[PDB]
Amino acid sequence: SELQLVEQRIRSFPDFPVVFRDISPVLKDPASFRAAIGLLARHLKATHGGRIDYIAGLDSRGFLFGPSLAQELGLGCVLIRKRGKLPGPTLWASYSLEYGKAELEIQKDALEPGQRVVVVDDLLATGGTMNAACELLGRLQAEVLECVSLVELTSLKGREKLAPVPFFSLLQYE
Amino acid sequence: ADSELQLVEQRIRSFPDFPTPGVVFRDISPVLKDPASFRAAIGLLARHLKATHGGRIDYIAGLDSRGFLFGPSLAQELGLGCVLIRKRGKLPGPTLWASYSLEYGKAELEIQKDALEPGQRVVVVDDLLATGGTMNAACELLGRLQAEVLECVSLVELTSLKGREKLAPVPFFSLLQYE
Ligand SMILES: O=P(O)(O)OC[C@H]1O[C@H](OP(=O)(O)OP(=O)(O)O)[C@H](O)[C@@H]1O
Ligand SMILES: O=P(O)(O)OC[C@H]1O[C@H](OP(=O)(O)OP(=O)(O)O)[C@H](O)[C@@H]1O
Ligand code: HPA
Ligand code: HPA
Ligand SMILES: [Mg+2]
Ligand SMILES: [Mg+2]
């Protein structure tokens, strides 16, 4: 099955850097990658029809899926970057993730008020990163339709921190 | 010009003195935001690589982080897997790393020791070539794994910084060139 093609390509590294779920094998197997993008695209098409304006990809591992998913849906991809990386006027927000702290940034002209966005990242843990991205999109007055990822770590309850924003993952681990 | 190249060129913006005085920053963000532009970029790079290597590529290597924006899409377009070369400290398991200089700083790149087997054929992709330091480091790590680096490609090339000369004799190709 398609989902199995993705599932078979997650490898785990205990005690890095925590059981680190490595998405690398998904990228390295063209069949696995196409299955992951296809499943995500199919989901978003079915759930939001044609109400999506842009995909937003989260620096850095989110960059691996964002543009491909956007392309599969005939949509542009906007970039939400680690602070200090984007040129021109920006907004930023600080946050905590599973194994540290960071800050995200977005260009002020990335989106206009009301525009509809789906945020994509590789993996959802505590939900801190995804929430910060939602906060930034919020300051631009964009509407966040949904957040999605390849992997979700259910024990960390990231889904709860995003509620009531819908969240969808292809794979779940405790 | 090729109408396809024009869809990419018209979506590059410039910012003076970011992130430090003297740098003219080429912002690729509009290319990603315009699906037609992004689509053209990937197609142009794929077409070049098919014509130049006749399908004899095993993997595309994408360079953290703006290289990640093009690597997987290009790989997919070619029916290929994409391997990651990351900023040091980000990849799990046994790794190799190398220090380098880029146009406006210095850093360290890293690759997993099992990313590639000896003799496997790779093309490296990044968003922009400036001094060539980043791509050179990637090539150095790929060489440690005994990978054959066939070519390096980017969307943008800043010709005054002579990055291409630093990569020689590894072939290089860019869609767009600016001084
Ligand atoms: O749900 P959370 O607890 O926020 O964790 C999830 C985030 O952590 C990782 O990013 P990281 O900051 O390691 O940077 P990277 O994307 O460059 O690996 C991962 O790629 C997610 O973005
Ligand atoms: O030819 P060079 O002089 O090495 O410069 C080009 C490199 O520098 C930039 O990366 P940066 O280190 O800014 O990180 P990013 O990819 O995360 O933006 C750019 O994305 C290239 O990777
Ligand atoms: O446990 C994890 N595994 C992989 N990536 C991550 N990003 C945040 N937490 C994790
Ligand atoms: O001048 C630049 N612009 C954009 N990205 C870059 N990465 C290195 N130099 C540059
Ligand atoms: Mg991340
Ligand atoms: Mg870079």
Short mmCIF file of C-alpha atoms and ligand atoms in Angstrom, two decimals:
data_model
loop_
_atom_site.label_atom_id
_atom_site.label_comp_id
_atom_site.label_asym_id
_atom_site.label_seq_id
_atom_site.Cartn_x
_atom_site.Cartn_y
_atom_site.Cartn_z
CA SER A 1 0.00 0.00 0.00
CA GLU A 2 0.98 3.62 -0.46
CA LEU A 3 0.99 4.32 3.28
CA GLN A 4 3.19 1.25 3.81
CA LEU A 5 5.68 2.61 1.25
CA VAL A 6 6.04 5.63 3.54
CA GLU A 7 5.91 3.70 6.81
CA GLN A 8 8.73 1.35 5.72
CA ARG A 9 11.02 4.34 5.16
CA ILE A 10 11.02 5.90 8.61
CA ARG A 11 14.09 4.92 10.60
CA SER A 12 14.52 5.56 14.30
CA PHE A 13 17.55 6.76 16.22
CA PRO A 14 17.21 6.33 19.98
CA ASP A 15 18.73 9.14 22.08
CA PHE A 16 19.37 11.76 19.41
CA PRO A 17 19.93 14.52 19.57
CA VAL A 18 14.50 11.34 22.46
CA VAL A 19 13.79 8.82 19.76
CA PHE A 20 14.57 10.70 16.58
CA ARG A 21 12.44 9.72 13.60
CA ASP A 22 14.62 10.09 10.50
CA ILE A 23 12.64 10.97 7.35
CA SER A 24 15.73 10.65 5.13
CA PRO A 25 14.83 7.21 3.69
CA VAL A 26 11.48 8.61 2.52
CA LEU A 27 13.30 11.24 0.45
CA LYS A 28 15.83 8.70 -0.80
CA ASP A 29 13.23 6.24 -2.14
CA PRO A 30 11.42 7.96 -5.03
CA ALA A 31 8.40 5.64 -4.61
CA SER A 32 8.09 6.49 -0.92
CA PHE A 33 8.34 10.23 -1.55
CA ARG A 34 5.72 10.23 -4.32
CA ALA A 35 3.38 8.20 -2.07
CA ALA A 36 3.79 10.68 0.80
CA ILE A 37 3.18 13.75 -1.39
CA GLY A 38 0.28 12.02 -3.15
CA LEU A 39 -1.43 11.03 0.10
CA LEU A 40 -1.04 14.54 1.51
CA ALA A 41 -2.27 16.16 -1.70
CA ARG A 42 -5.25 13.82 -1.94
CA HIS A 43 -6.18 14.61 1.67
CA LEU A 44 -6.01 18.37 1.19
CA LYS A 45 -8.00 18.22 -2.05
CA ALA A 46 -10.71 16.16 -0.36
CA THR A 47 -10.87 18.32 2.78
CA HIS A 48 -10.54 21.87 1.48
CA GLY A 49 -11.53 21.50 -2.17
CA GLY A 50 -10.20 24.59 -3.91
CA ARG A 51 -10.17 26.93 -0.93
CA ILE A 52 -6.39 26.82 -0.47
CA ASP A 53 -4.41 29.84 -1.65
CA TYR A 54 -0.90 28.83 -0.58
CA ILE A 55 1.17 26.18 1.11
CA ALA A 56 3.53 27.40 3.80
CA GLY A 57 6.68 25.34 4.37
CA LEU A 58 8.64 25.42 7.64
CA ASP A 59 12.43 25.84 7.55
CA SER A 60 14.17 23.49 7.22
CA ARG A 61 12.78 19.96 6.92
CA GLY A 62 9.36 21.36 5.98
CA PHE A 63 11.10 22.74 2.87
CA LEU A 64 11.51 19.13 1.73
CA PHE A 65 7.76 18.59 1.36
CA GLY A 66 6.21 22.03 1.03
CA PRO A 67 7.14 22.90 -2.58
CA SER A 68 6.37 19.40 -3.87
CA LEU A 69 2.97 19.43 -2.18
CA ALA A 70 2.25 22.95 -3.44
CA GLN A 71 3.19 21.86 -6.97
CA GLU A 72 1.02 18.74 -6.77
CA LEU A 73 -1.91 21.07 -5.94
CA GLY A 74 -1.08 23.80 -8.49
CA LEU A 75 -0.31 26.18 -5.62
CA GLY A 76 2.51 28.49 -4.65
CA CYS A 77 4.60 27.88 -1.56
CA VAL A 78 5.47 30.65 0.89
CA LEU A 79 8.45 30.31 3.24
CA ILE A 80 8.48 30.51 7.01
CA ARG A 81 12.14 30.72 8.00
CA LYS A 82 14.38 30.58 11.04
CA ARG A 83 14.94 34.15 12.23
CA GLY A 84 17.59 36.22 10.45
CA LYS A 85 17.36 34.36 7.14
CA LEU A 86 14.79 36.31 5.13
CA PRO A 87 15.50 39.73 3.57
CA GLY A 88 13.29 42.82 3.79
CA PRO A 89 10.61 43.68 6.36
CA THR A 90 9.62 40.70 8.51
CA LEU A 91 7.69 39.56 11.56
CA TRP A 92 9.08 37.00 13.97
CA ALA A 93 7.99 34.84 16.90
CA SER A 94 9.87 32.76 19.49
CA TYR A 95 9.00 29.24 20.64
CA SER A 96 10.02 25.96 22.23
CA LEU A 97 10.29 22.66 20.34
CA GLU A 98 10.99 19.13 21.61
CA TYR A 99 14.75 19.40 22.12
CA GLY A 100 15.30 23.17 22.24
CA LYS A 101 14.19 26.74 21.55
CA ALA A 102 14.11 28.78 18.35
CA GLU A 103 12.47 31.64 16.47
CA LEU A 104 10.61 31.77 13.15
CA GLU A 105 10.14 34.66 10.74
CA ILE A 106 8.02 35.56 7.74
CA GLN A 107 8.24 38.37 5.19
CA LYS A 108 5.54 40.99 5.70
CA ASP A 109 4.39 40.73 2.08
CA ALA A 110 4.20 36.93 2.08
CA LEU A 111 0.42 37.04 2.26
CA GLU A 112 -2.47 39.47 2.24
CA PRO A 113 -5.25 39.52 4.84
CA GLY A 114 -7.77 36.72 4.33
CA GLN A 115 -5.62 34.52 2.11
CA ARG A 116 -5.98 30.83 2.98
CA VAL A 117 -2.94 28.71 3.90
CA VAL A 118 -2.07 25.13 4.77
CA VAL A 119 1.11 24.80 6.83
CA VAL A 120 3.39 21.83 6.22
CA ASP A 121 6.22 20.37 8.23
CA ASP A 122 7.96 16.97 8.30
CA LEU A 123 7.15 16.04 11.88
CA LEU A 124 4.92 17.23 14.72
CA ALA A 125 6.16 16.78 18.26
CA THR A 126 5.27 19.29 21.00
CA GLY A 127 3.62 21.43 18.33
CA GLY A 128 5.69 24.47 19.33
CA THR A 129 7.11 25.06 15.86
CA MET A 130 3.78 24.69 14.08
CA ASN A 131 2.06 26.94 16.62
CA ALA A 132 4.66 29.68 16.14
CA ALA A 133 4.12 29.45 12.39
CA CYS A 134 0.36 29.78 12.93
CA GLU A 135 0.95 32.82 15.16
CA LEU A 136 3.02 34.46 12.42
CA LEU A 137 0.41 33.74 9.76
CA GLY A 138 -2.10 35.19 12.24
CA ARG A 139 -0.31 38.53 12.42
CA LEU A 140 -0.62 38.76 8.64
CA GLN A 141 -4.34 38.02 9.07
CA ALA A 142 -4.06 34.91 6.91
CA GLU A 143 -6.53 32.11 7.54
CA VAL A 144 -4.84 28.86 8.54
CA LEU A 145 -7.03 26.09 7.16
CA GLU A 146 -5.02 23.14 8.41
CA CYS A 147 -1.58 21.96 9.48
CA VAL A 148 -0.09 18.74 8.11
CA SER A 149 3.00 16.58 8.58
CA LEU A 150 4.42 13.19 7.58
CA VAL A 151 4.94 12.11 11.18
CA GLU A 152 3.17 12.86 14.46
CA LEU A 153 4.41 11.88 17.92
CA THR A 154 1.11 11.44 19.75
CA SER A 155 2.50 11.26 23.30
CA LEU A 156 3.74 14.86 23.01
CA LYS A 157 0.18 16.09 22.32
CA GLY A 158 1.16 18.62 19.63
CA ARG A 159 -2.33 18.22 18.16
CA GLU A 160 -3.80 19.79 21.32
CA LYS A 161 -1.62 22.91 21.07
CA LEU A 162 -2.88 23.48 17.52
CA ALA A 163 -6.60 22.99 18.34
CA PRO A 164 -8.97 23.97 17.06
CA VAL A 165 -6.92 24.18 13.86
CA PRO A 166 -7.29 20.88 12.02
CA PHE A 167 -4.20 18.68 11.93
CA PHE A 168 -3.40 15.69 9.71
CA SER A 169 -0.43 13.31 9.76
CA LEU A 170 0.31 10.26 7.59
CA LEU A 171 2.03 8.37 10.41
CA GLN A 172 1.68 8.29 14.19
CA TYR A 173 4.12 7.06 16.84
CA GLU A 174 3.80 7.18 20.63
CA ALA B 1 14.85 33.93 -24.68
CA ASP B 2 13.15 30.70 -23.65
CA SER B 3 9.75 31.71 -22.28
CA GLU B 4 10.36 29.10 -19.54
CA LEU B 5 13.55 30.86 -18.43
CA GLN B 6 11.66 34.18 -18.42
CA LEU B 7 9.07 32.82 -15.93
CA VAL B 8 11.96 32.16 -13.50
CA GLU B 9 13.93 35.37 -14.13
CA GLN B 10 10.90 37.61 -13.56
CA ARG B 11 10.47 36.12 -10.07
CA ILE B 12 13.86 36.94 -8.53
CA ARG B 13 14.07 39.97 -6.22
CA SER B 14 17.14 41.79 -4.95
CA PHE B 15 17.83 43.41 -1.58
CA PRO B 16 20.91 45.56 -1.01
CA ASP B 17 23.12 45.02 2.03
CA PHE B 18 21.45 41.90 3.41
CA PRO B 19 22.56 40.23 5.51
CA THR B 20 25.65 42.46 5.72
CA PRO B 21 26.68 45.61 3.88
CA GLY B 22 28.04 44.92 0.39
CA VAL B 23 25.98 41.82 -0.35
CA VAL B 24 23.21 42.09 -2.93
CA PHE B 25 20.80 39.37 -1.80
CA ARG B 26 18.93 37.41 -4.49
CA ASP B 27 15.55 36.42 -3.05
CA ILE B 28 14.11 33.28 -4.63
CA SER B 29 10.92 33.53 -2.59
CA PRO B 30 8.76 34.74 -5.49
CA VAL B 31 9.80 31.73 -7.62
CA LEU B 32 8.37 29.40 -4.96
CA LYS B 33 5.24 31.50 -4.51
CA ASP B 34 4.46 31.48 -8.24
CA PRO B 35 3.66 27.86 -9.13
CA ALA B 36 4.29 28.49 -12.83
CA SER B 37 7.76 29.87 -12.08
CA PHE B 38 8.67 27.02 -9.74
CA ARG B 39 7.39 24.52 -12.30
CA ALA B 40 9.47 26.07 -15.07
CA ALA B 41 12.61 26.04 -12.89
CA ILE B 42 12.32 22.33 -12.09
CA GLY B 43 11.51 21.47 -15.71
CA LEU B 44 14.46 23.46 -17.03
CA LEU B 45 16.86 21.78 -14.63
CA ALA B 46 15.41 18.32 -15.31
CA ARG B 47 15.65 18.81 -19.05
CA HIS B 48 19.29 19.88 -18.75
CA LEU B 49 20.18 16.88 -16.59
CA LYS B 50 18.37 14.38 -18.87
CA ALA B 51 20.16 15.79 -21.92
CA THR B 52 23.54 15.82 -20.15
CA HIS B 53 23.46 12.46 -18.34
CA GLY B 54 20.95 10.30 -20.24
CA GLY B 55 19.36 9.11 -17.00
CA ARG B 56 22.63 7.82 -15.55
CA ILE B 57 22.03 9.48 -12.20
CA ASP B 58 21.36 7.56 -9.01
CA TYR B 59 20.59 10.39 -6.58
CA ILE B 60 20.06 14.13 -6.36
CA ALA B 61 21.73 15.74 -3.33
CA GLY B 62 19.96 18.79 -1.91
CA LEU B 63 21.86 21.34 0.19
CA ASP B 64 20.37 22.58 3.48
CA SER B 65 18.40 24.75 3.51
CA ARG B 66 17.34 26.61 0.37
CA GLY B 67 18.58 23.63 -1.67
CA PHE B 68 15.87 21.53 0.02
CA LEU B 69 13.31 23.70 -1.80
CA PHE B 70 14.41 22.32 -5.21
CA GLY B 71 16.17 19.00 -4.54
CA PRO B 72 13.20 16.70 -3.89
CA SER B 73 11.08 18.20 -6.67
CA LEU B 74 13.92 17.85 -9.15
CA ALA B 75 14.60 14.30 -7.96
CA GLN B 76 10.93 13.39 -8.30
CA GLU B 77 10.78 14.90 -11.77
CA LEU B 78 13.66 12.61 -12.74
CA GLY B 79 12.35 9.48 -10.98
CA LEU B 80 15.20 9.69 -8.49
CA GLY B 81 15.76 9.68 -4.76
CA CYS B 82 17.10 12.75 -2.96
CA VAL B 83 19.84 12.61 -0.33
CA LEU B 84 20.39 15.32 2.26
CA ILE B 85 23.52 17.26 3.05
CA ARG B 86 22.84 19.33 6.14
CA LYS B 87 24.25 21.94 8.48
CA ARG B 88 26.39 20.14 11.03
CA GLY B 89 24.55 18.78 14.08
CA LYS B 90 21.22 18.15 12.38
CA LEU B 91 21.60 14.58 11.05
CA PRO B 92 21.34 11.49 13.26
CA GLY B 93 23.77 8.56 13.22
CA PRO B 94 27.36 8.32 11.91
CA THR B 95 28.36 11.36 9.87
CA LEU B 96 31.20 13.09 8.03
CA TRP B 97 31.59 16.85 8.04
CA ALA B 98 33.57 19.71 6.52
CA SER B 99 34.08 23.39 7.31
CA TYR B 100 33.73 26.02 4.60
CA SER B 101 33.24 29.68 3.74
CA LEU B 102 30.25 31.14 1.88
CA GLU B 103 29.79 34.69 0.58
CA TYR B 104 28.73 36.20 3.92
CA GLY B 105 29.89 33.76 6.57
CA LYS B 106 31.29 30.37 7.48
CA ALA B 107 29.73 27.10 8.52
CA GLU B 108 29.99 23.33 8.51
CA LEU B 109 28.17 20.81 6.29
CA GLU B 110 27.56 17.17 7.14
CA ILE B 111 26.41 13.98 5.47
CA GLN B 112 25.37 10.60 6.89
CA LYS B 113 27.98 7.88 6.30
CA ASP B 114 25.35 5.61 4.72
CA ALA B 115 23.83 8.28 2.48
CA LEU B 116 25.56 6.76 -0.54
CA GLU B 117 27.49 3.65 -1.53
CA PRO B 118 30.83 3.78 -3.34
CA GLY B 119 30.45 4.51 -7.05
CA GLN B 120 26.92 5.86 -6.87
CA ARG B 121 26.30 8.72 -9.28
CA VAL B 122 25.12 12.04 -7.86
CA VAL B 123 24.04 15.51 -8.97
CA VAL B 124 24.18 18.31 -6.41
CA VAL B 125 21.54 21.02 -6.37
CA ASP B 126 21.38 24.31 -4.53
CA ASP B 127 19.35 27.50 -4.95
CA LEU B 128 22.28 29.82 -5.59
CA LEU B 129 26.01 29.63 -6.38
CA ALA B 130 28.09 32.54 -5.12
CA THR B 131 31.67 31.90 -3.89
CA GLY B 132 31.12 28.17 -4.48
CA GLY B 133 32.20 27.32 -0.93
CA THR B 134 28.97 25.54 0.00
CA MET B 135 28.84 23.39 -3.14
CA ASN B 136 32.54 22.66 -2.89
CA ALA B 137 32.06 21.33 0.65
CA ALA B 138 29.18 19.14 -0.52
CA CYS B 139 31.39 17.74 -3.30
CA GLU B 140 34.17 17.10 -0.79
CA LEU B 141 31.84 15.09 1.48
CA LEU B 142 30.36 13.18 -1.47
CA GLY B 143 33.94 12.31 -2.48
CA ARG B 144 34.61 10.95 1.01
CA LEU B 145 31.77 8.47 0.42
CA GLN B 146 33.36 7.61 -2.95
CA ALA B 147 30.38 8.98 -4.83
CA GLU B 148 30.82 10.14 -8.40
CA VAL B 149 29.66 13.76 -8.57
CA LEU B 150 28.55 14.25 -12.16
CA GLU B 151 27.42 17.87 -11.99
CA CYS B 152 26.30 20.68 -9.70
CA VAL B 153 23.32 22.89 -10.54
CA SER B 154 21.65 25.99 -9.15
CA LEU B 155 18.88 28.39 -10.08
CA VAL B 156 21.10 31.44 -9.78
CA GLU B 157 24.80 32.07 -10.38
CA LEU B 158 26.65 35.23 -9.28
CA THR B 159 29.40 35.33 -11.89
CA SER B 160 31.70 37.97 -10.33
CA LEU B 161 32.32 35.66 -7.36
CA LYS B 162 33.79 32.98 -9.66
CA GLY B 163 32.14 30.05 -7.84
CA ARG B 164 32.19 27.94 -11.00
CA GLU B 165 35.99 28.19 -11.08
CA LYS B 166 36.17 26.88 -7.49
CA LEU B 167 34.11 23.82 -8.51
CA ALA B 168 36.22 22.92 -11.54
CA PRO B 169 36.68 20.35 -12.75
CA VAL B 170 33.22 19.32 -11.54
CA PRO B 171 30.85 20.58 -14.25
CA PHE B 172 28.37 23.29 -13.25
CA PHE B 173 25.09 24.65 -14.69
CA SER B 174 22.85 27.54 -13.68
CA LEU B 175 19.54 28.80 -15.04
CA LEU B 176 20.27 32.48 -14.39
CA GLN B 177 23.48 34.51 -14.14
CA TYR B 178 24.07 37.94 -12.56
CA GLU B 179 27.31 39.82 -11.94
O1 LIG C 1 6.63 19.93 17.31
P1 LIG C 1 7.94 20.53 17.76
O2 LIG C 1 8.31 20.13 19.18
O3 LIG C 1 8.09 22.00 17.49
O4 LIG C 1 9.06 19.81 16.85
C1 LIG C 1 8.95 19.74 15.42
C2 LIG C 1 10.02 20.56 14.69
O5 LIG C 1 11.36 20.26 15.10
C3 LIG C 1 12.18 19.97 13.95
O6 LIG C 1 12.80 21.14 13.37
P2 LIG C 1 14.26 21.68 13.83
O7 LIG C 1 14.00 22.91 14.67
O8 LIG C 1 15.06 20.55 14.45
O9 LIG C 1 15.04 22.23 12.52
P3 LIG C 1 15.15 21.49 11.08
O10 LIG C 1 13.76 21.56 10.50
O11 LIG C 1 16.17 22.34 10.37
O12 LIG C 1 15.63 20.10 11.40
C4 LIG C 1 11.19 19.43 12.93
O13 LIG C 1 11.69 19.53 11.59
C5 LIG C 1 9.98 20.29 13.20
O14 LIG C 1 10.06 21.52 12.46
O1 LIG C 2 28.36 29.95 -3.02
P1 LIG C 2 28.41 30.31 -1.55
O2 LIG C 2 29.25 31.53 -1.29
O3 LIG C 2 28.65 29.15 -0.64
O4 LIG C 2 26.90 30.80 -1.26
C1 LIG C 2 25.74 30.05 -1.65
C2 LIG C 2 25.08 29.37 -0.45
O5 LIG C 2 24.77 30.29 0.61
C3 LIG C 2 23.37 30.28 0.90
O6 LIG C 2 23.05 29.41 2.00
P2 LIG C 2 22.98 29.92 3.53
O7 LIG C 2 24.25 29.43 4.18
O8 LIG C 2 22.66 31.40 3.54
O9 LIG C 2 21.81 29.09 4.27
P3 LIG C 2 20.31 28.77 3.79
O10 LIG C 2 20.46 27.85 2.60
O11 LIG C 2 19.73 28.09 5.00
O12 LIG C 2 19.66 30.09 3.48
C4 LIG C 2 22.72 29.72 -0.34
O13 LIG C 2 21.47 29.11 -0.03
C5 LIG C 2 23.75 28.72 -0.82
O14 LIG C 2 23.60 27.48 -0.11
O1 HPA C 3 11.65 13.30 17.91
C1 HPA C 3 11.88 13.91 16.83
N1 HPA C 3 12.31 13.24 15.74
C2 HPA C 3 12.58 13.85 14.56
N2 HPA C 3 12.42 15.17 14.36
C3 HPA C 3 11.99 15.94 15.38
N3 HPA C 3 11.76 17.27 15.42
C4 HPA C 3 11.34 17.54 16.69
N4 HPA C 3 11.29 16.40 17.45
C5 HPA C 3 11.69 15.37 16.69
O1 HPA C 4 23.95 37.15 -2.69
C1 HPA C 4 23.29 36.17 -2.29
N1 HPA C 4 21.94 36.13 -2.40
C2 HPA C 4 21.19 35.09 -1.98
N2 HPA C 4 21.71 33.99 -1.41
C3 HPA C 4 23.05 33.92 -1.25
N3 HPA C 4 23.80 32.96 -0.71
C4 HPA C 4 25.09 33.38 -0.78
N4 HPA C 4 25.18 34.61 -1.36
C5 HPA C 4 23.94 35.00 -1.67
MG MG C 5 11.98 21.66 11.45
MG MG C 6 22.00 27.62 1.35
#
